[PDB]
Design an enzyme around this catalytic site. Structure first.
Site, mmCIF file in Angstrom:
data_model
loop_
_atom_site.group_PDB
_atom_site.id
_atom_site.type_symbol
_atom_site.label_atom_id
_atom_site.label_comp_id
_atom_site.label_asym_id
_atom_site.label_seq_id
_atom_site.Cartn_x
_atom_site.Cartn_y
_atom_site.Cartn_z
ATOM 1 N N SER A 7 7.540 -3.266 -10.594
ATOM 2 C CA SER A 7 8.374 -3.619 -9.458
ATOM 3 C C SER A 7 8.979 -4.990 -9.720
ATOM 4 C CB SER A 7 7.572 -3.616 -8.149
ATOM 5 O OG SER A 7 8.375 -3.993 -7.040
ATOM 6 N N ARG A 8 10.172 -5.220 -9.180
ATOM 7 C CA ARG A 8 10.765 -6.550 -9.200
ATOM 8 C C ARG A 8 10.628 -7.257 -7.861
ATOM 9 N N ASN A 9 9.949 -6.631 -6.898
ATOM 10 C CA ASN A 9 9.749 -7.213 -5.580
ATOM 11 C C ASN A 9 8.462 -8.024 -5.599
ATOM 12 N N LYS A 12 5.231 -6.946 -3.560
ATOM 13 C CA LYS A 12 4.222 -6.023 -4.069
ATOM 14 C C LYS A 12 3.120 -6.769 -4.810
ATOM 15 N N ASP A 69 5.295 4.478 -5.259
ATOM 16 C CA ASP A 69 6.380 5.357 -4.833
ATOM 17 C C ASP A 69 6.060 5.779 -3.409
ATOM 18 O OD1 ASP A 69 8.421 7.658 -4.855
ATOM 19 O OD2 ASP A 69 8.553 6.839 -6.893
ATOM 20 N N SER A 70 6.995 5.541 -2.479
ATOM 21 C CA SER A 70 6.766 5.734 -1.057
ATOM 22 C C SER A 70 7.980 6.379 -0.416
ATOM 23 C CB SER A 70 6.472 4.413 -0.342
ATOM 24 O OG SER A 70 5.265 3.855 -0.822
ATOM 25 N N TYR A 154 12.773 4.510 8.310
ATOM 26 C CA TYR A 154 12.628 5.602 9.257
ATOM 27 C C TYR A 154 11.707 5.269 10.429
ATOM 28 C CZ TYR A 154 14.809 8.455 5.579
ATOM 29 O OH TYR A 154 15.644 8.964 4.608
ATOM 30 N N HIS A 172 -7.818 -3.328 19.702
ATOM 31 C CA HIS A 172 -8.813 -2.263 19.793
ATOM 32 C C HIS A 172 -8.554 -1.222 18.712
ATOM 33 N N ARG A 173 -7.280 -0.855 18.547
ATOM 34 C CA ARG A 173 -6.906 0.038 17.455
ATOM 35 C C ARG A 173 -7.022 -0.658 16.103
ATOM 36 N NH1 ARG A 173 -2.023 0.506 14.681
ATOM 37 N NH2 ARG A 173 -1.779 2.467 13.522
#
Lengths: 191, 190, 199, 196
Positions: A7-9, A12, A69-70, A154, A172-173
């Protein structure tokens, strides 16, 4: 040991660096090694495509390589947008256009058949040729109209299972997920 | 907080407690009223782990983790799948399951003998949130069994990156594979 | 014109001849794998009868330059991710022991409830022309797997295949079944015509 | 005996009726959806033309008690996991906008090398009898997706579908040529051993 992150980000690598403490690994990115041609991605398999990217990293550097990959998998689209998630409308990186196409494609589909999942896959390939790939799937469905402003991609149209709010409507979650997540990685035991 | 582990295997619950080393009490299916476990079909370890985790929530109101693991062989359209433990028709007959697999693949050239060990884990919350993760260890099917340090299909599973079978691997070699699998599982941006 | 049928069974070529006579085609002699030099036949894997019929037909064209028709049939079981697939005839590991294939399938499925015992008999046919055109067709007869074998007028998986629309197995159907004939006799051609690829 | 053709297109019955004469099947009357009371048609999803043809044929039997034939056709592209699938005619979100459907597909596939542009035209047909017997057939015409449209002798995706074995798109084929592909498809369908 040096490990190539395909990755170039830097986002990550920063997350990966802090997650690897939970031991002497030095991470390098694609911006630290000579550029090479990136094969375009097709299909619905985030896992296969993460493996392809990780294989290429080893091939060009001789280092162990992690790649990811996402994207979004929609039952009614045979689990596409898949690895075309970021360019589903034909226009790379245009989140509003990708969402608009998805809604229009599904505009007649009743809620019961709008199931979908956010998917994230990570592959590791070693210089000796070992291959391991992991993925996570967050189950939900596609909304009928976008809602919420605290999200990218999305998020305004992805409704996580267990509620009616979209991901972009989430603030709580936390204590339940934060303690349960480690057990999901632990019961994974490939050896 | 109680978290239901959808298993009757006490060794699994004990190992899961050892990974928690946070005010979390793990409970097993044997600690909650018995309910009927629906038989599993197909190739999706992910779908079947989710089914078991949902069932745990439905009967207890607790967050529930469930797992589902086995062997996926390209030439069998990713079966044995969730029938891995009973592929010969007889549950727990590892030697016959292995012999059947070899016989089914007896004329298949190396290039098409690809396979993977798969392990999927699902979480379902009392509110109905669902997350499933899986790990795949890529390799291929041997032509003859080798090695004695393994269970199930280990004597015929050749990890990519070598020629030795999983059953031929040392304990040190096996931990290095599970440490990297769990390290990837934590890296998942999702 | 010569057409290669990728088969060693003369009965198969005879039926294709009868379909070319009832389709109104003339001047077409069918040749078999025994009429052309032997070539290596790649073993079959997976669930796709269509892909495997195409692989066989391409190979036939490759070795003869003739248009080649190939077929591929078997059983697809939902609970086995649509296997036995192209391993149907050797599901127990050994070609030609039908009884062992059937016993293995039953044993594999022994705890699966009726609702999830769905299956189909599948038959695929591929044509590849000398110019490289590829067309593949398949038919699926929907049903489910019985829990115990029944019937004596059948081979292979017929004693454990329950066609949708009844409780009887394929091996339990009487030869007079193959009122049901007149409905099939009129409907089967209609499935053939409506496969309209050239648009 | 009455057989319901699950279509409102009168052309479908005529083509099927002409086949009952070429079989020689006597005493069979074809009925269309326009001859039976209207019922709701459920929208179609996914890539399986076979499943969706069966769903439509089952619905016909349910509402009429007649044996029912139904069809389902479209484009399957390897790189889109065999979509557009049963969404082929509305791939852009708008039913019947061929220019928009084709341009989106091209845009989705840009930079995809020729080796991975494989695709097929698929045409599936199902039969369900009053007793609940189910048979479904499909034919697939193998090819790949062009990079630019060519030809005007076709509708829908014809200008960007390159049949295996040539470089021209389906829309560039002559009528003599497009006739021979349906003839071989229907001849293969009649050859299927299980049809026995």
């Amino acid at each position: 040991m040096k490990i190539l992150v395909a990755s170039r980000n830097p986002k990550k690598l920063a997350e990966l660096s802090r997650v690897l403490e939970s031991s002497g690994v030095e991470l390098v990115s694609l911006t630290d090694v000579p550029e090479y041609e990136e094969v375009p991605e097709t299909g619905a398999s985030f896992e296969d495509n993460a493996l392809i990217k990780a294989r290429e990293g080893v091939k060009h550097t001789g280092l162990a390589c992690v790649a990811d990959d996402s994207g979004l998998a929609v039952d009614a689209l045979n689990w596409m947008p898949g690895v075309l998630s970021a360019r589903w409308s034909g226009r790379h990186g245009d989140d509003a256009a990708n969402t608009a196409l998805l809604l229009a494609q599904l505009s007649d589909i009743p809620d019961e058949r709008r199931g979908a999942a956010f998917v994230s896959a990570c592959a590791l390939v070693t210089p000796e040729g070992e291959e391991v790939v992991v993925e996570g799937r967050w189950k939900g469905s596609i909304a009928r109209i976008p809602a919420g402003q605290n999200g990218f991609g999305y998020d305004p149209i992805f409704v996580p299972r267990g509620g009616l709010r979209t991901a972009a409507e989430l603030t709580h979650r936390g204590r339940a997920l934060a303690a349960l997540l480690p057990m999901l990685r632990n019961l994974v035991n490939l050896g």
